[PDB]
Write a protein that binds this ligand. Sequence first.
Ligand SMILES: *[C@@H]1O[C@H](CO[C@@H]2O[C@@H](C)[C@@H](O)[C@@H](O)[C@@H]2O)[C@@H](O[C@@H]2O[C@H](CO)[C@@H](O)[C@H](O)[C@H]2NC(C)=O)[C@H](O)[C@H]1NC(C)=O
Lengths: 49, 48
Amino acid sequence: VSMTKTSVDCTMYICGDSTECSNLLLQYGSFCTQLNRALTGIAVEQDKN
Amino acid sequence: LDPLSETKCTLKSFTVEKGIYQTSNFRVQPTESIVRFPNITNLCPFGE
Ligand SMILES: *[C@@H]1O[C@H](CO[C@@H]2O[C@@H](C)[C@@H](O)[C@@H](O)[C@@H]2O)[C@@H](O[C@@H]2O[C@H](CO)[C@@H](O)[C@H](O)[C@H]2NC(C)=O)[C@H](O)[C@H]1NC(C)=O
């Protein structure tokens, strides 16, 4: 009927506590926000189901 | 400024509809620095 809801901090997975890596990751634009928008859509749906 | 301003800024809208919104993860930052090196007094013999 449902599966495990997950959320993934794209900054902490890619760059965990580094600031240099954050300033480089910003050059890809919306990809981290788009990943969290996708996993939030999956997570809201587990309650709809 | 405040948690609502961070939602307006994350939704890219000056108005926010009713809901619960995920925002920037919090994280406690360093209180101080540490260094721990083995205590050695003698310099390396690079002249030799
Ligand atoms: C290699 O030697 C240079 C200098 O040659 C010696 O200088 C005197 C100290 C004395 O030993 C002379 O008989 C030699 O000719 C060293 O360069 C010095 O480095 C220090 C910092 O460590 C600096 O304060 C000095 O101004 C430098 N002086 C000169 C002339 O270079 C160098 O340190 C030596 N390298 C090693 C690995 O010992």
